[PDB]
Design a protein around this ligand. Sequence first.
Ligand SMILES: [C-]#[N+][C@@H](Cc1ccc(O)cc1)C(=O)O
Length: 308
Amino acid sequence: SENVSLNNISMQILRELLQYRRHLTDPVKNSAKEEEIIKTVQLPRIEYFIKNKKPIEFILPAFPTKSPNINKVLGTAPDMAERLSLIFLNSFCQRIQLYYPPGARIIICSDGHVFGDLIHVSDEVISQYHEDIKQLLHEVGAINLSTFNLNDDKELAEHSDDFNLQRQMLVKHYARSEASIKDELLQNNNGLQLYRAVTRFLYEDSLNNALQKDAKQRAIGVIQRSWAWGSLLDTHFPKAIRLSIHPQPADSIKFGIHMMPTRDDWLTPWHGVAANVNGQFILMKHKEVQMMGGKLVNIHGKPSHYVI
Ligand SMILES: [C-]#[N+][C@@H](Cc1ccc(O)cc1)C(=O)O
């Protein structure tokens, strides 16, 4: 029968994923139950790829652009924190080859032009971040990793000239009402914790109650836009395992993933800087490292990381 063998393969890929799971840390939660739920969730989607002897396909939306706050991050360009995370992702795909020869691939999807106005970053800066991240993949030989653009969608008419044109088309065909959004965020403690995180980060990027009010409204907007980019991808790559840089419920189709060691569930490399602390690279915010006795290190002139 050998379905035990097929289960043995897919369970190794799941067990590796689990070692890197990004979730809402709560001691009331019995993580054991969470996995048992996750196993039921993702194992079948994995097995679609093994059964057809194809590579395991992962879809991740991430690296949209670097945060504007100099206080939060060190530069506009992708620093060492991006590089290490990119390097980890591609290596994640190779260890799968040791179990499973077809291997695994991740189509990283650029989130930048989607919400670029709501986050207060120029469409031009976002574009440069994007070319750079592709270059970082070539510099580093991250073969298993791919990029998926906003331009890649056939329906947008290649509006390089007007991203706003691309923006309106995505909202029409793929967005839900912000009214329908606030409702959905508020039903579950997961939805509530997404809402706060998105509002906090937007407030942090600004750098007061009125500013907090702006973040609360901008949050529902940035959520709506990022969930549109989700449905665009939801149709394009349906059978692909879903990776997120956000914490996820154990019942979600999305699987939350960490790409660096970090004390924050929501911190991602475009909201931080890479710090070498006790011979371990850590993701921490550029201010918090400055109060730390942190010596900046720079590579190719542009600063890459802070060493402690
Ligand atoms: C999804 N998503 C992003 C949203 C974002 C990105 C960049 C930025 O400067 C501000 C907010 C995240 O939560 O990291």
